[PDB]
C-alpha cells in the first residue's frame, strides 16, 4: 500500500490543483495604465530523495533507521517539485474580450515542500536493497 502511494498517488494528488492563476484586472484609472496582468504558478513533476536529516548547524546527511531510533529523530525523506512560473499580460481595450499573451517571462528549479516519512523496508527505504549481510552491517535485525 505504501509503495503504491509513494510511486503513483503522490504525483496524482499534486496534479489536481497544480495550477494557480491570479488575475490583475485593468483597474482603469488613467489611459497610461490599461494593461491587465495574469500571473500563474504551475507544479510539474515531483521528486523524492532518500531518507535524510538536517541538523541544527545546517549539515545534512543520510539517516539510517538505527540512528533515527537512538536520537529520537524522524525517518523521513524530502519532497521536491519542479515549478513552472509564467505571466501573461494584454491590453485591456474597453468593452472587449482580452487576449492574454506570454510576456517573455518564464522561469523554471526544485522547491522543497516538506518531508514525507518513509516506512521501513519500502522501495524508498535504505533496507530494501540491503542483503542479509548488509542488514547485519547496519545493525538491523533480518
Amino acid at each position: 500500500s505504501f509503495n503504491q502511494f509513494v510511486d503513483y498517488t503522490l504525483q496524482d494528488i499534486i496534479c489536481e490543483d497544480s495550477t494557480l492563476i491570479l488575475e490583475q484586472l485593468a483597474q482603469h484609472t488613467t489611459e497610461s495604465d490599461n494593461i491587465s496582468r495574469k500571473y500563474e504558478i504551475s507544479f510539474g513533476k515531483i521528486y523524492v530523495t532518500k531518507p535524510m536529516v538536517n541538523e541544527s548547524d545546517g549539515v545534512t546527511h543520510a539517516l539510517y533507521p538505527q540512528e533515527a531510533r537512538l536520537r529520537n529523530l524522524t525517518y523521513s525523506s524530502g519532497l521536491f517539485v519542479d515549478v513552472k512560473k509564467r505571466t501573461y499580460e494584454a491590453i485591456d481595450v474597453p468593452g472587449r474580450e482580452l487576449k492574454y499573451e506570454l510576456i517573455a517571462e518564464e522561469s523554471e528549479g526544485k522547491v522543497f515542500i516538506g518531508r514525507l516519512p518513509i516506512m521501513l523496508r519500502s522501495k524508498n527505504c535504505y533496507l530494501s536493497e540491503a542483503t542479509e549481510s548488509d542488514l547485519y552491517k547496519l545493525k538491523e535485525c533480518p
Binding site: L20, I21, L22, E23, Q24, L25, Q27
Partner: peptide, 9 residues
Amino acid sequence: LRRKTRQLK
C-alpha cells in the same frame, strides 16, 4: 471599482 485581485478556477 473591482477588487483588483481575483482568482479564477
